[PDB]
């Protein structure tokens, strides 16, 4: 699931750890399984979480 | 360049014109049909297919006849090539007579050796015997297989396997006669080949 999060996160211009740090600054607690299969299937949901993680560490 | 195939007949002696005995092989030929011309645009070569004998027409196939039919001849046994010749001078269906080696006299001769079956490890490689007396038991054997430490056998420790049957050139021989009416080249020396076998005869390389 880390490797799949790697590829799908790198698709949206985020390296594979700044998601982790941003989503914990956005205080979000998704398991790595759930981000893996949402990253495969729901492009809209994964880009929504990607934009809130862009917004989180933007401070 | 100058290339002619042919048979192999035997061994004779010929006095030269100062009265000297010389051993001489007897090599035939016939008229000699060029079958194809291979160029760079088609094969990336420059080469010429040649062929020497007359089969009966029972003893061939339709594709052999489809090769032969562009030169209007009989279907033949042996078919070889020749590389590195400045072409011109060659059409599909010419004949290369025996006349090309008048006194060229610097010629490589190739054949195939005889065949001698399974033989011992002496008669190939010239490895010597062991002592035939003083109580030993080691008359005609191929040695020791190597050291101990590598736990294997290194490659090329040569042993008993069939003698002869591969093709061998001999470089820089002379030519004595050319008998145009009988299609015979006479050569000093010795040629690897059993009787009736093929021989290729070319102009030599090393000038």
């Amino acid at each position: 699931w880390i490797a799949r999060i790697n590829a799908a996160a790198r698709m949206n211009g985020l390296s594979y750890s700044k998601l982790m740090h941003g989503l914990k600054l956005a205080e979000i607690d998704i398991n790595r399984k759930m981000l893996a299969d949402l990253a495969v299937n729901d492009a809209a949901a994964f880009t929504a979480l990607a934009e809130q993680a862009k917004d989180a560490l933007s401070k | 360049t100058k290339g002619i195939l042919g048979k192999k007949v035997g061994m004779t002696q010929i006095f030269t014109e100062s009265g000297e005995l010389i051993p001489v092989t007897v090599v035939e030929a016939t008229p000699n049909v060029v079958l194809q011309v291979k160029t760079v645009e088609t094969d990336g070569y420059e080469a010429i297919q040649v062929g020497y004998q007359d089969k009966r027409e029972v003893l061939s196939n339709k594709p052999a006849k489809g090769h032969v039919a562009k030169a209007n001849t009989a279907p033949k046994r042996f078919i070889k090539e020749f590389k590195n010749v400045e072409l011109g001078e060659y059409e599909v269906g010419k004949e290369i007579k025996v006349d090309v080696f008048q006194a060229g006299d610097v010629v490589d001769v190739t054949g195939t050796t005889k065949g001698k079956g399974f033989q011992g490890a002496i008669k190939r490689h010239g490895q010597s015997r062991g002592p035939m007396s003083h109580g030993s038991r080691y008359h005609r054997r191929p040695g020791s297989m190597g050291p101990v430490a590598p736990n294997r056998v290194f490659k090329n420790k040569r042993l008993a396997g069939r003698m002869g049957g591969d093709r061998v050139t001999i470089q820089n021989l002379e030519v004595v006669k050319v008998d145009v009416e009988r299609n015979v080249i006479l050569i000093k020396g010795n040629i690897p080949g059993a009787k009736k076998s093929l021989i290729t005869i070319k102009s030599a390389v090393k000038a």
């Binding site: 699931w1 490797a3 799949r4 590829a7 | 290194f154 490659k155 090329n156």
Partner: protein
């Protein structure tokens, strides 16, 4: 046993990519190229199935060798016969067989399974600047890597 995707053999479409090599060193070209062929940069892994892509290489070559190593990285081949080490190449392979550079320094980068063979035959390395493969409509990558 529950729900994660295990992709099949004929589910993932493949693509065709074109990569230049004008004055980039060997290691980083080979690294990006070898990470392409396993199926990374695609969120649909298996460790079973060739989810990778096809990679064409132009201008083999004009690859750098940084600092020295023009005359120094000696390759070695041994021929399973006694004394048969042949160190015949050097950085000479830039001049002749510049196919043979990248086909070694990428084959090292891959696993040595059977997938490290089916994922190797998708390379095509050309020292010149021509596609014979224009029938398949390949795209272009940009390396800032």
């Amino acid at each position: 046993m529950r729900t994660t995707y295990m992709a099949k053999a004929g589910e993932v479409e493949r693509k065709w990519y074109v990569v230049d090599a004008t004055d980039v060193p060997l290691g980083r070209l080979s690294a990006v190229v070898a990470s392409v062929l396993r199926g990374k940069n695609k969120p649909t892994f298996t460790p079973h199935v060739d989810t990778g892509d096809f990679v064409i290489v132009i201008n083999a070559d004009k690859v750098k060798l940084t600092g020295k190593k023009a005359t120094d990285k000696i390759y070695y081949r041994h021929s399973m016969y006694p004394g048969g080490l042949k160190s015949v190449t050097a950085g000479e392979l830039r001049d002749k067989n510049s196919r043979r550079l990248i086909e070694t320094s990428v084959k090292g980068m891959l696993p040595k399974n059977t997938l490290g063979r089916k994922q190797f035959t998708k390379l095509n390395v050309y020292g010149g600047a021509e596609h014979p493969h224009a029938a398949q409509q390949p795209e272009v990558l940009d390396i800032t890597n």
